Design a protein around this ligand. Structure first.
Ligand SMILES: NC(=O)c1ccc[n+]([C@@H]2O[C@H](COP(=O)([O-])OP(=O)(O)OC[C@H]3O[C@@H](n4cnc5c(N)ncnc54)[C@H](OP(=O)(O)O)[C@@H]3O)[C@@H](O)[C@H]2O)c1
Ligand SMILES: NC(=O)c1ccc[n+]([C@@H]2O[C@H](COP(=O)([O-])OP(=O)(O)OC[C@H]3O[C@@H](n4cnc5c(N)ncnc54)[C@H](OP(=O)(O)O)[C@@H]3O)[C@@H](O)[C@H]2O)c1
Ligand SMILES: Cc1cc(C)n2ncc(C(=O)N[C@@H]3[C@@H]4C[C@@H]5C[C@H]3C[C@@](O)(C5)C4)c2n1
Ligand SMILES: Cc1cc(C)n2ncc(C(=O)N[C@@H]3[C@@H]4C[C@@H]5C[C@H]3C[C@@](O)(C5)C4)c2n1
Lengths: 258, 259
């Protein structure tokens, strides 16, 4: 049902686009047409992405560098991004603070940092984007993980932040339905992706199974365009069938009665 | 399988005990002849609880007042609590920052406050309690909600923090199994409870028939004692069957088997 024609000329923001899925998403959006603004901390890397985007045939490519640790930047960004494009119709939140597979000892600093960058930031951005997105009847795309739906050891603070996204975004989605706010909330559940970051991170655990970033990225955009509630992407059909929870849907609708 | 005899003489912390489920938990534990350390911000209210606890037959009852907004408070708390009891056999994290049913507009302050009090605090406490709990082979009891497992409008920041607890605690539970840390992590998923706070928050908004706090409270403690992963408590059997996530448990175990 998806068409690349849909995205042509649309005002898109991609966070965490200097590398990983973000970069391939910016690259995918840079085809036929689309106005794409990218953000990450890496100044030069972002400029490089910006250039290849235009070479791939993007309607307009712009970067704004900075940390999502600082919340005021996060607001400032959406404003400038919204100024460069005039409007904004799709916000793709996909950045995360650096995480390594490791046993949780006592790094409360890391739990807080994870909370700030992988969660709070997305909320701050959404709030900042909401006026602009309301008038375009746009979409918020939150990039989550299997760990955002299930418990894995060695990713406690990462899981905590990815579970918080579902908690929050799944709930404001319910609010937007009742309050009739015509803005889409697409939550993306991913398994291992063949990104360099993941590849560096994965040792002991295999590693060989990790899915292609190219397909993954396009699948996120597709879901966003099609205004889906969830996007499941994994190297396994089995994990994909197993991730879906009917019981939750039934419970959520069961209270929607009154 | 549970027995009140189990709790007799055990050193227990109950956060958010000046009222609500916390207070009934302190009250049941009191009746069971355990040592109780209670915390909340309300100085006098806590003293009141402390007294009735001893009258109910608690082995010891002590209150340490303070905000879980401030993280240094949270560490200092566990130290003194530990000092008063000598050790710690069960940590019951049950406090929350005040929440009102409301549409999420742009209160980032509230999202952050919710995150700090309902989540970060619990982690800070757990970390602070972990050395004392390790040597007693104790239990951490995290009090979550239906909204900690499912999406409801008017509770976005509340759900965000309760979903973060599952995320975090469910994961360190997996870690403790592999790393062989003999400390239990009990997550309690609750529906509406007949607490005055709830009753008020929900009186004008859609009321859905709340369950008794007395039974709820005891059910949390039971689960903790029995060292259960999850505790389900609702006014409905229907919601109780519907909350359980079999697919998740199968997927989590399906990786466990492999690694
Ligand atoms: N690949 C997988 O195995 C996997 C699995 C599940 C979910 N996902 C999700 O996929 C998304 C993309 O992950 P990835 O594999 O592409 O990882 P990646 O290569 O680590 O990309 C992370 C992005 O976030 C940026 N970033 C990091 N810290 C930041 C900060 N404080 N401020 C601003 N930007 C920051 C990075 O740029 P700078 O370093 O330039 O700041 C980069 O562009 C993430 O949301 C991740 O949770 C991936
Ligand atoms: N009842 C329900 O409908 C329901 C449903 C699902 C889950 N739950 C969970 O059940 C548990 C019990 O909640 P409840 O609603 O029954 O009790 P409640 O009356 O809302 O109790 C809140 C407790 O936390 C304390 N507290 C509030 N703000 C604080 C702060 N910033 N710092 C430190 N302590 C603070 C309060 O004392 P002060 O005001 O004296 O400081 C009080 O002792 C919570 O974890 C709640 O999430 C309840
Ligand atoms: C190991 C593993 C296995 C499976 C099946 N999944 N499914 C999703 C994830 C996931 O979210 N991975 C994250 C973790 C690990 C890597 C890659 C990525 C960013 C990072 O910082 C470093 C934290 C996952 N991890
Ligand atoms: C809307 C709704 C629907 C269902 C089915 N449930 N099931 C559990 C809760 C829940 O935990 N809500 C919280 C909120 C609102 C009240 C009650 C409780 C503590 C409080 O402080 C005050 C914040 C709930 N809410």
């Amino acid at each position: 049902e998806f068409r690349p024609e849909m995205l042509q000329g649309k005002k898109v923001i991609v966070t965490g686009a200097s590398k990983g899925i973000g970069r391939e998403m910016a690259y995918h959006l840079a085809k036929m047409g689309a106005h794409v603004v990218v953000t990450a901390r890496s100044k030069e890397t972002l400029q490089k992405v910006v250039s290849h985007c235009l070479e791939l045939g993007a309607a307009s490519a712009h970067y704004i560098a900075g940390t999502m640790e600082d919340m005021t930047f996060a607001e400032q960004f959406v404003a400038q991004a919204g100024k460069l494009m005039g409007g904004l119709d799709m916000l793709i939140l996909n950045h995360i603070t650096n995480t390594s597979l490791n046993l949780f000892h006592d790094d409360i600093h890391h739990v807080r940092k994870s909370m700030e960058v992988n969660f709070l930031s997305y909320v701050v951005l959404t709030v900042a984007a909401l006026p602009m997105l309301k008038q375009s009847n746009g979409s918020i795309v939150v990039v989550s993980s299997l760990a955002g739906k299930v418990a894995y050891p060695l990713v406690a603070a990462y899981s905590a932040s990815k579970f918080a996204l579902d908690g929050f975004f799944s709930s404001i989605r319910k609010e937007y339905s009742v309050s009739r706010v015509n803005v889409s909330i697409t939550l993306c559940v991913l398994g291992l992706i063949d990104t360099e970051t993941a590849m560096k991170a994965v040792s002991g655990i295999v590693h060989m199974q990790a899915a292609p970033k190219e397909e993954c990225a396009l699948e996120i955009i597709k879901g966003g365009a099609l205004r889906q509630e969830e996007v499941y992407y994994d190297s396994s059909r089995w994990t994909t069938l197993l991730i879906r929870n009917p019981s939750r849907k039934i419970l959520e609708e069961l209270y929607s009665t009154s």
